[PDB]
From Swiss-Prot, chains A, B:
It catalyses: limonene 1,2-epoxide + H2O = limonene-1,2-diol. Gene3D superfamilies: 3.10.450.50. The gene is limA. This is Limonene-1,2-epoxide hydrolase. Catalyzes the conversion of limonene-1,2-epoxide to limonene-1,2-diol. Can use both the (-) and (+) isomers of limonene-1,2-epoxide as substrates and also has some activity with 1-methylcyclohexene oxide, cyclohexene oxide and indene oxide as substrates. It comes from Rhodococcus erythropolis.
Length: 145, 145
């Protein structure tokens, strides 16, 4: 997938310049592992993960459960981060995730702006904002929201 | 509107601390005017506005047309900004917008994360990321995506 017209060099992923920005970019790379056990290592005990506005997962256990269930029906084939930046303890990623439904083989491009909060290098909060119209079809799980 | 559990006092709207952050907050306040003629004044000639992943408006004319059309069928009744922050020339707003359908009187709460790029105090880019599942019903305009 190509770089959008509005992409700004000043905030490109390769220009990450804080420890937290770099950790989040590592996490973005690890997403294609489709491995909840690998991914949960990035989270603190006191944490949350939410695909807005679906019910949020609070605590590391719930997060791991959610990720595991997700990777049961969907593969993250690619993550392209156009922008990374940070402010007042929050890290922002403007990106596209390519998701593939395991039962159907259909692929989906999701334009996503996500916010991360890290405490001592571990994720205490992750909220992704994107259009969920196709997320329902892409994920063979009830959304519950 | 209630403060979400994950809200950080460190990045609260009232703590906006750069000229750009303050401008974007002023624009957030102006949205409830439902007045495209008022709103387009915040924009540069070279600009874009997109509700991801719907077709983008490029140039000031298209943006004003889009805003006018939206305000023909929907009222922005409230904008609650939980977080504002900025980094590498971009401004981020984590917020909820309350939209009301004019033909039905039905209200909708949208959880939105928006990125803004400003040049000399004027909007050069505005992209809102949120779930469009209800946007379709909320807006009595054909979606082009």
């Amino acid at each position: 997938i190509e770089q959008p017209r509005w992409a700004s060099k000043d905030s490109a992923a390769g220009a990450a310049s804080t420890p937290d920005e770099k950790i989040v970019l590592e996490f973005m790379d690890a997403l294609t592992s489709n491995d909840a056990a690998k991914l949960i290592e990035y989270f603190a005990e006191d944490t949350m993960y939410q695909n807005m506005p679906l019910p949020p997962a609070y605590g590391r256990d719930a997060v791991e459960q959610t990720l595991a269930g997700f990777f049961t029906v969907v593969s993250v084939d690619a993550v392209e981060t156009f922008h990374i930046g940070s402010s007042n303890g929050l890290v922002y990623t403007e990106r596209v995730d390519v998701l593939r439904a395991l039962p159907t083989g259909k692929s989906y491009n999701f334009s996503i702006l996500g916010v991360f909060q890290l405490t001592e290098g571990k994720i205490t909060g992750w909220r992704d904002y994107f259009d969920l119209r196709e997320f329902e079809e892409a994920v063979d799980l009830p959304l519950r929201g």
